[PDB]
């Protein structure tokens, strides 16, 4: 499991990046919905 231990920071960073992108996309979608209501 040494290779997985070495790659674990990369996997954690990738998951963090993915979560950040998903949260930003959902935030932008809600803003767009408010624009549509306006």
């Amino acid at each position: 499991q040494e290779l997985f231990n070495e790659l674990k920071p990369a996997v954690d960073g990738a998951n963090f990046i993915v979560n950040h992108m998903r949260d930003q996309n959902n935030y932008n979608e809600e803003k767009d919905s408010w624009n549509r209501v306006a």
Partner: peptide, 23 residues
């Protein structure tokens, strides 16, 4: 395997930048 270590460093830097942007 220097390439994998460099990719790990790049991913870690990207994650750190995103975390700083979140703060």
């Amino acid at each position: 395997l220097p390439e994998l270590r460099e990719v790990v460093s790049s991913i870690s830097y990207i994650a750190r930048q995103l975390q700083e942007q979140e703060d």
